[PDB]
Symmetry: C2
Subunit: 132 residues, 2 copies
């Protein structure tokens, strides 16, 4: 069982300097918004999967853009009732390759997404911009 550890310490009002393996970032009221960070966590996790999968399937990736939008419940806790994720692959990428990468990631490989899926409505979409 791989162990992941982070440590937070108050830096400013309701804000925390957060120590991770690569460095420290400020998260909180006056720093990176916590719920936006959750989306970044989801996007990067899945993004890592899509990148490796597209590469394994011989696609030529010039760039990968991932857009995430979350709609929060109005009452506490204000979790995301819905999360929209749109994947845009740029380069010589076949739509079928991107679809496989997205589905394997969202349904099997991305750990962050697997942890929140049961608590929200996930809407996934994707598109390719063929470029040389």
């Amino acid at each position: 069982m791989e162990v992941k550890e982070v440590e937070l310490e108050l830096s400013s009002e309701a804000t925390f300097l957060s120590k991770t393996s690569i460095g420290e970032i400020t998260a909180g009221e006056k720093g990176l918004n916590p719920m936006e960070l959750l989306l970044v966590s989801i996007g990067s996790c899945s993004g890592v999967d899509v990148y490796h999968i597209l590469k394994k399937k011989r696609q030529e990736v010039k760039d990968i853009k991932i857009f995430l939008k979350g709609k929060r419940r109005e009452k506490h806790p204000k979790i995301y009732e819905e999360i929209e994720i749109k994947y845009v692959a740029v380069g010589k990428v076949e739509e079928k390759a991107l679809e496989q990468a997205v589905k394997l990631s969202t349904e099997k490989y991305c750990s962050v997404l697997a942890m929140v899926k049961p608590s929200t409505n996930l809407k996934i979409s994707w598109e390719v911009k063929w470029e040389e």
Copy 2:
């Protein structure tokens, strides 16, 4: 329904520059680790709750340290089978005040934590270091 939005773009191999409301951070294989970021997201979210609650209940906070440890499943998706969160309040803080803040946060206010709770075993603990 408040809407939160972030946008990611490939920056280096399997890494993404992630645009949020305060700025951009690198998340991925060569940047902030995605699963460590989830822990930072959880810690800061809850941390924001604890800070405000302790303040409302007239406690004199000199500092707040939050330690999070996650134990991941060995098979995909490698979600956290367990997440340990330890809250340390420093200053003129009564243990009862910290307990109330932690429980209200973990059971009602923190949105990030509410989204992953159903998928893992959460172990919460706390302590105060009385300081003047």
